[PDB]
Known about the structure:
This is part of a larger assembly, with 2 copies of chain A and 3 copies of chain C.
Chain A (H helix, E strand, L loop, with lengths): L2 H5 L18 E2 L8 E2 L23 H14 L15 H5 L1
Antiparallel strand pairs in A: 1-2
Chain C lengths: L8 E6 L4 E5 L15 E6 L2 E10 L6 H6 L6 E9 L3
Organism (chain B): Paenibacillus sp. 453mf
Protein name (chain B): SIR2-like domain-containing protein
Amino acid sequence: DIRTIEENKLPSRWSKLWKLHGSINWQLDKQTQTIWRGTPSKGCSLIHPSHLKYDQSRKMPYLVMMDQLKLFLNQPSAILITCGYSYKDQHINEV
Amino acid sequence: SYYDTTQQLSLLKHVLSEDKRPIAFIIAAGCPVSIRHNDAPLIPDVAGLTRKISDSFDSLLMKIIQNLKTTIPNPTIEDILSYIRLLQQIPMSGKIHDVENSVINALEESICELIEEEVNVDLPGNATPYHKIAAWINSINREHQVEIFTTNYDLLMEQALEELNVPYFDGFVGSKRAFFDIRTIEENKLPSRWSKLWKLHGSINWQLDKQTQTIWRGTPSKGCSLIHPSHLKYMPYLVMMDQLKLFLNQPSAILITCGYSYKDQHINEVLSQGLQTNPNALIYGLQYDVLENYQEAKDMALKRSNLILLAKDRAIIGKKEGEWKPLFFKLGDFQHLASFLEEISQ
Amino acid sequence: MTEASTYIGTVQDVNGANIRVVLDINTISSYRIGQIGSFVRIPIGYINLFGIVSQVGAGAVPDKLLEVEPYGHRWISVQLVGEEGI
Amino acid sequence: SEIDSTILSQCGTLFALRMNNSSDRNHVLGAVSDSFEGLMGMLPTLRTGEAIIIGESVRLPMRTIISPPPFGRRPDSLDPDVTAKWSNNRVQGDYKEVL
Amino acid sequence: KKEFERGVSQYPTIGDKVHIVTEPDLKKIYGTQNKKYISLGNIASVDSIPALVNIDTLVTRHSAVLGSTGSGKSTTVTSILQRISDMSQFPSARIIVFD
């Protein structure tokens, strides 16, 4: 689901978890770009999603997570804590 | 099953005569081909550039063409340029064509030099359609200024808009180096009088200075250009497409495409996303050809309701294909559209 | 900006071909303001609707407004004549 | 306003074009049996060609634009052209033959 | 989902939402599947709609055309007579004009 990210209407007690680099249970669909999450497929997984030509734009979980981080940072917050980051990624550093 | 031209033109004239609605434009490669300077066209279309490259350059060129055609239809200049840059991404890429590399790096420079020398054609006298469009731009003191998007590598828009001195802003700020700015793009805190012109596919005066990896515009150097369609640098393209997407989200926005063939892929997808996000957006697709030659446009029209596609013989409106009431609708031609704009200006 | 030159009022009643306009010019009374035989121009988006004044004063006020406030008469009655094409 | 009311009242369908004066409009409104106040106020300002078809031959009183006949054949009386004839130079006449 | 029939069944109450009629709705209203009705023109609002007019009631009941001389009533009558007397559709027409 994509739109419910943008309306951002979620329970206050509910937390949000985003996986920037992907997971080992994500699996794409041959028919169309789906990237559905379920039981870990035998051998098939989405690791480091960087080769999709942005086909079916906004369906890539990378861009939506990046935009979520950007919109959170643009919010007039006052706290952000990082741990274990090696600062070896240019895309995260630039944003 | 039937449509009449007069009512469509009347509706369009009603639309263009409102200053509350923001207005934009898309000036693709189909506009320059509509003006003749010499016996030959002033600027050939993409097929013209492909033919000129084919007959001007040989064995490795044909090998590359065969390799790309093995899985793709008739190519364009963008396709071969992207293939060349993708090969340049891999260091030891010279074994694919058995050329040992270091030759493609010069072939691409030769192609860039040929294209940059061919596209520099200068504008003819003050009777050009672009002059009429520029005159129409500043004719009315609209409260929302009109933005212009161009996929052309040339500078006809610049010459035409400067011949009738009008407010202008393309993102670059400066006088000697004209350093590209990003912040001033994002706050959008500019006076309403200043017009906005944006080149999605890059110009010919853009030079990559390397070194500090910075971009700057200005005088066109020899051989060094930034003609890149999209490129994959580690950027103006992404932020400028974001600007287009942000514009399409404005309430009651009108966008007119002239001479656009809809053959691009990212542009079509961002247009579809903008149309689906805000139902109040409205896009006038103007073509000069048989409607059967635009399959992607037909799919978009059948998918997005608020997209109006008008062709010479047939027209599809509101997910319902039809035909003109007794070719018609000469508004697809750039000259006729310019005459229409200049007559509605007064 | 504000109402430019050659401004009179706004349409406040339509009965097909009998327009009633409320005057906005306070005390101009001097091209003179709309007389009986004068013409007025009503632009709709692109085309201008030309009309002729027919009633000025208490004759143009709606019936219920007179019953409510019978001391203020700033209304004119316009009858449409034709339109300017393209 | 001249046609007998007892005759105009028996006509099933009326094609009300633009009527300028007030007697004709009143006489027409008094002889119609399916009146919509929205459309009956539109009579003085109908375009040259528009019609308001009212009566038993239509489901609803509709405001139409009658399809024009093809160009090259339109009703036109061949009355003498005053300006063209008066603009010509005067030639000598033979009034003996007229007698 | 049958058709458009004159006369309502239950009236609206306070707060009911009021919408605007779109072109397909107009086609539903001003359209019919009967074979007697004949298109004579187009509605003024949108030109894609045909103005269906019955022909049995037009002739059998009666007709009448009223309008000013500057409204071009002659062209309307000529178009109506030409449309009724089409050779391909009505090969056995019968009309007398008292010009």
